[PDB]
Write a protein that binds this ligand. Structure first.
Ligand code: BJZ
Length: 180
C-alpha cells in the first residue's frame, strides 16, 4: 500500500567495513524490489550523530538506490539508538521532506549491539517498528530481549535476529515473499 518506510542503520565503530556494506546492499535490494510501488523511502545512518542520507523527497526525485547511497560514509563512532529513533520520528517523517499524510509509517532499524545512550522512544511509538539485530551480541534470549523496547509488538514478529551480516541475504529472500 501507501507506505513511507525509513531505514535507520548502525554505523558505529563495532561494525566491520564488509558488515556495513552488507547493510547498504540489503537496503538497495529492498528498494529495488519495491520500485514502481506506492512505497517511498528514506535512510538515516546513526552512530554518535544522526545523518539523513536521503529524505523521501530525494527518493521521489531519483528512485535510484545506487545514486541515493553512493556517498554514504561509515561514521565509526558510538551507537546512540535512542537519539537516532527520536531523530527519525521528529526530523524525517515530515511533509516538508516528502512524507505523505495518509501513508503508513514504517521504520526498519538495523544494528549489531545495545544502544550506548538512554531515554525513551515515546515519540516514535505509533510507527510500525522492526529491528534487525545481527551478530555475536545477540546469541542468547537475554541479550536479544534488549532490542524489544525498540520494536512494535509482538517481538516474535518485529524483532529479527541474524547470527551474521551474511544472513541479511537470507532475510531479504524471506521478506521478498511477504510482498503482496
Ligand atoms: C511484513 N513486513 C515485514 O516483514 N516488513 C519488514 C521487516 C523487516 Cl525486518 C525489514 C523490512 Cl525492509 C521490511 C515490513 O515492512 C512488512 C510490514 N508492512 C506493512 C505495511 C503496511 C501496514 C499497514 O498499513 O498497517 C503494515 N505493515 C510491509 C511489509 C513488507 C514486507 C516485505 C518487504 C520487502 N522486501 C517490505 C515490506
Amino acid at each position: 500500500m501507501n507506505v513511507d518506510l525509513v531505514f535507520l542503520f548502525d554505523g558505529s565503530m563495532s561494525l566491520q567495513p564488509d558488515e556495513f556494506q552488507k547493510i547498504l546492499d540489503f537496503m538497495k535490494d529492498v528498494m529495488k524490489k519495491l520500485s514502481n510501488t506506492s512505497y517511498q523511502f528514506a535512510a538515516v545512518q546513526f552512530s554518535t550523530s544522526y545523518k539523513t542520507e536521503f529524505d523521501f523527497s530525494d527518493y521521489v526525485k531519483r528512485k535510484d538506490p545506487d545514486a541515493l547511497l553512493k556517498h554514504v560514509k561509515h561514521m565509526l563512532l558510538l551507537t546512540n539508538t535512542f537519539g537516532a529513533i527520536n531523530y527519525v520520528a521528529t526530523e524525517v517523517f515530515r511533509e516538508e521532506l516528502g512524507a505523505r499524510p495518509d501513508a503508513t509509517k514504517v521504520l526498519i532499524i538495523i544494528t549489531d549491539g545495545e544502544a550506548t545512550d538512554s531515554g525513551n522512544i515515546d515519540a516514535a511509538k505509533d510507527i510500525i517498528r522492526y529491528i534487525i539485530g545481527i551478530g555475536k551480541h545477540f546469541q542468547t534470549k537475554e541479550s536479544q530481549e534488549t532490542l524489544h523496547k525498540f520494536a512494535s509488538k509482538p517481538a516474535s514478529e518485529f524483532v529479527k535476529i541474524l547470527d551474521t551480516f551474511e544472513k541479511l541475504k537470507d532475510l531479504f529472500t524471506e521478506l521478498q515473499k511477504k510482498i503482496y
